Design a protein around this ligand. Sequence first.
Ligand code: Z80
Ligand code: CA
Ligand code: CA
Ligand code: CA
Length: 180
Amino acid sequence: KNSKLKQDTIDRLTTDTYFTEKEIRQWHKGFLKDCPNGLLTEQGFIKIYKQFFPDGDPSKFASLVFRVFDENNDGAIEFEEFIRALSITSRGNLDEKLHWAFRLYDVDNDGYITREEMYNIVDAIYQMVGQQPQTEDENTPQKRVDKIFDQMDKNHDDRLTLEEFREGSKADPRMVQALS
Ligand SMILES: CN(C)CCCN1c2ccccc2Sc2ccc(Cl)cc21
Ligand SMILES: [Ca+2]
Ligand SMILES: [Ca+2]
Ligand SMILES: [Ca+2]
């Protein structure tokens, strides 16, 4: 019964996250309000994003986030996955946050961010806003991303490793700023 919070789950969570046992039990109550039976599917996750961005279509972005939350790739976000992601994004140190962002941009999980993956995240963000925006010629989404990508791509091989992305993002936080 996915609804019941087991002690074994709490034990791993207090080891792996910055939440106390009392905080985890309180979060489990709120989690059950949005997800009474304890498992959030991708459609369920898209549905919550749609409510929050009524003038856009956040489906593409929500699906990208969902796959990073769903660490075991079983098609549902369990409470333990929710708490782990919340710990990283709301309490984690800068290296932990940037690793999470790297996983979001690395759509195919091959260990590299390509320009095309970065374009795709940006396009998804624009869709969520609800705008495929007309831009001046030098301000196109591709042009903006390309200049930031080029500065992070220190060996100019058209892909970003975790280290290129993380150190580059410390000098220029815009790619991860856009995620929030
Ligand atoms: C205000 N709230 C909806 C929580 C914040 C938004 N958001 C989110 C959505 C639904 C369930 C959990 C989360 S945590 C989170 C972590 C990373 C990113 Cl990129 C987004 C989110
Ligand atoms: Ca899962
Ligand atoms: Ca990739
Ligand atoms: Ca590179």
